[PDB]
Amino acid sequence: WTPLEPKLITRLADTVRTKGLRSPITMAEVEALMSSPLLPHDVTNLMRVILGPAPYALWMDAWGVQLQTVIAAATRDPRHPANGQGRGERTNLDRLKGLADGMVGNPQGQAALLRPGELVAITASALQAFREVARLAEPAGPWADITQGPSESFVDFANRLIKAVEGSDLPPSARAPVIIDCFRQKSQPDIQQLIRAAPSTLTTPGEIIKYVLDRQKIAP
């Protein structure tokens, strides 16, 4: 786990802003730092600094497509650098994500696992996702967009929310009440009433659900 210096990125991003986020210099400056390969996690951290958390999420969406494009591209052209080595290994979105066994929980080891080149793909793909956001401008939320539905399980959804919050720009405290707050934010009245009727002795993304589930039980 190698923490990158945001101060440096901040200075670079500062120039981008001064030059205009919608300006070309952005790609130049961004390409300057990104000139080299990096991790996907840091990519978000970097972009987050360059672009607020609002547009950050938008970058994720574009990043997803950009990443997918690389996967399909590699699939179409058995000569992609993001590929293990040949058309045998073949690149994967998950792999580029770093969820591959041996890569999860290990950034350095993950990069060392991923041949030299795929990183660049992420860097470029990230740059592409950036321009996508620069073009757009929608104040969307990470968890704000996440809403609990009747079609989707409460726990299943809660996981998606928790996972979102976990990978969101929140302080060391908002990562608990925000998730639960989300539930009592919209969700349903039945569930809402459960949370609202919940005890004031617990307020974490675990006991709240555990309690709700404990209450839900199985009448029928």
Q: How far is CA 219 from the centre of its chain?
A: 38
CATH number, domain with residue 154 = 1.10.1200.30
Domain holding 13, by residue range, is: 1-140
Statement to judge: residues 72 and 159 lie in one domain = no
Nearest to 36 by CA among 111, 105, 94: 111
Instruction: Give the CATH number of the domain where residue 64 resides.
Output: 1.10.375.10
Q: Give the separation between CA 165 and CA 15, rounded to whole angstroms.
A: 30
Q: How far apart are CA 26 and CA 4, in angstroms?
A: 20
Q: 3-class SS at 101? A: coil
Write down the experimental method used for this entry.
NMR
Alpha carbon distance 14, 29 (integer Å): 10
Task: Decide if 51 contacts 22 (C-beta within 8 A).
Answer: no
Given 99, 115, 140, which residue is the final one in a domain?
140
Number of structural domains in the chain:
2
Co-location of 99 and 146 in the same domain: no
Question: Helix 40-50 vs helix 118-135: angle between axes, to the nearest 10 degrees?
Answer: 30
Tell which of 108, 140, 172 closes a domain: 140
Rounded to whole angstroms, how far apart are CA atoms 160 and 123?
26
Tell whether 121 and 200 lie within a shared domain: no
Task: Please say whether the beta carbons of 208 and 169 come within 8 A.
Answer: no
CA 171 to chain centre: 16
